[PDB]
């Protein structure tokens, strides 16, 4: 599976993308969209601003 | 369409538009 890890700590903006915190790591993060992505932080699932996360290896 | 580019990346040597 994937996992990913947010640089920093961002607010989703719409509902169909969720908030994690810097430390706070997430798993099952695919890849969607070339700008976009989606992971399950905490038992849910969103989308993830490449922005502000890094999907781990 | 699903096309949508993140937000910008915070950084502190940035500068305003405006002086």
Redesign the interface.
């Given at each position: 599976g994937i996992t990913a890890v947010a640089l920093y700590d961002y607010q989703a903006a719409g509902d169909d993308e969720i908030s994690f915190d810097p430390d706070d790591i997430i798993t099952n993060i695919e890849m969607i969209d070339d700008g976009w992505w989606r992971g399950v932080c905490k038992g849910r699932y969103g989308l993830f601003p490449a922005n502000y996360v890094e999907l781990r290896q | 369409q699903?096309?949508?580019?993140?937000?910008?990346?915070?950084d502190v040597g940035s500068k305003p538009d405006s002086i």
């Open positions: - | 699903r096309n949508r580019m993140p937000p910008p990346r915070p």
